[PDB]
From a paper:
The pentameric peptides were composed of a 4-mer peptide synthesized with a combination of uncharged L- and D-amino acids and a γ-Glu: this residue enabled synthesis of both head-to-tail cyclic and linear peptides, respectively, for each peptide through either allyl ester or t-butyl ester C-terminal protection (see Materials and Methods for amino acid composition and cyclization protocol). The cyclic peptide with the highest fluorescence signal intensity was NQpW[γ-Glu], while the comparable linear peptide showed no measurable fluorescence signal intensity on the array. As the array data would predict, the linear version, NH2-[name]-COOH, exhibited no measurable binding at peptide concentrations of ≤2 mM. Asn1 and Gln5 engage in polar interactions with Thr90 and Ser88, respectively. Further, the backbone carbonyl oxygen of Asn1 is hydrogen-bonded to Ser27 and Tyr43.
As a proof of concept, we used this platform to identify both known and novel L- and D-amino acid peptide binders to the well-characterized model target, [name]. The surface loops of [name] are flexible: upon biotin binding they undergo a conformational change to form a closed conformation, but to accommodate the peptide ligands, loop 3/4 is dislocated by 13–16 Å from the biotin closed form to adopt a well-defined peptide-specific [name].
Residue numbers in the entry:
A (entry chain C), D (entry chain N), G (entry chain F), H (entry chain E): 1 to 5
B (entry chain A), E (entry chain D): 15 to 136
C (entry chain M): 16 to 135
F (entry chain B): 14 to 136
């Protein structure tokens, strides 16, 4: 959601 | 006005979606605005014939966190509703599940909530 | 693999195709036997999972509108596929209803479903 | 999920 | 400063809590501010030795929706963290489970999120 | 409440002992791992002390903050669920585990899951 | 949470 | 819930 998610 | 458009949260993410006549949601989720390496496919569904009394339009979408550069072996689903008016919003709750072994499956899933608008934060 | 016909603990049927591009496409039937309870589903899965024994992450959505019924709601399942002799899809789900602002605090139900390819 | 959901 | 005190959300609810030295949370949750018929016991736990780097203090509490006047055969648990600073906040996610038959258990639990502050809404 | 009061087991190896008081209180101890006193934590919660008699379950919830005299995980779990009633003694729950985090990591502060507990230890 | 909850 | 939780 943030970064790699 | 409508679901189709470019949306932002207050944590630096954005998504671009198209709400098709058949109830489909298709688009892209960019976890860090302006960083093209953070773009992932988004697919979902929405209610194409919602109630008329001011009730929101139910919708949901999924992003699997794999693109051609990065794979976090996980996926997030956002479940929520689109609300119209002067400043349209999509209010959601989400579940982020990671692939784990059976021993670690009890802690495989994060939960949270996000609200999106079409206005980019200043 | 993920492609196939799945059944949850309550008897609902989930027919899915897992595409080479990470796409999940199919239909979800809330009650066995009638076309009236069949809905489109779309989702995504990790097409290159870890090779250390971990499950394969996935998710999908069903908006509860078809040519027969409209519940003005949508469910998203988030989970992982676990391969083996008795393959399983273990999920948690969120069912959000379209509500007015006064009722938005109670718009969403949460639950969990486990699917197998064994017909009840 | 059950019935109409 | 601290968890002990009177808290409010933006949907007209309030609660009073004491965070005991032993990690206990005790208090009363009032569903509608100024309506004494909407007061219920709250009990929970919190981390009495949290991290010092600005991380929140983990906590949780339960309210069973039975009092001397009303019984909704249900209970909500709030799970979250207390964050200090100029305007302290308690950020939570919650689960509201109702007593149901096994046939209706799939729809027994609502999920949501609430943020509380000590500032009474105007 | 004789039904809820007792020792409960989950399939994951955790156990808890609880007393359901006449005033709606749940008090007890949760043991995350078998025979390890260093894995024992205080549990407190509430339950509906006058449930429906129509075959519905009894609603309940409890919290465990993951601090004891030996360990501190700076986190707390709340279980929300119902005591099923009927021949098999079972409590079905969903839970939220929130960790204390900085603002930057608050979006990923909470895990969600589900646990089922029985008075007869699973095999 | 609101009303009787 | 397991381990330290």
């Amino acid at each position: 959601n943030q970064x790699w998610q | 006005a409508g679901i189709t458009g470019t949306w932002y949260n207050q944590l630096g993410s954005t998504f671009i979606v198209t709400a098709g006549a058949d109830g489909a949601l298709t688009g892209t989720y960019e976890s860090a605005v302006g960083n093209a390496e953070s773009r992932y496919v988004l697919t979902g569904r929405y209610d194409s014939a919602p109630a008329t009394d001011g009730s929101g339009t139910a919708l949901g979408w999924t992003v699997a966190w794999k693109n051609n550069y990065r794979n976090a072996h996980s996926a997030t689903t956002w479940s929520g509703q689109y609300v119209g008016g002067a400043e349209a919003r999509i209010n959601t709750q989400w579940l982020l599940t990671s692939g784990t072994t059976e021993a670690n499956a009890w802690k495989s899933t994060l939960v949270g909530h996000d609200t999106f608008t079409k206005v980019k934060p200043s």
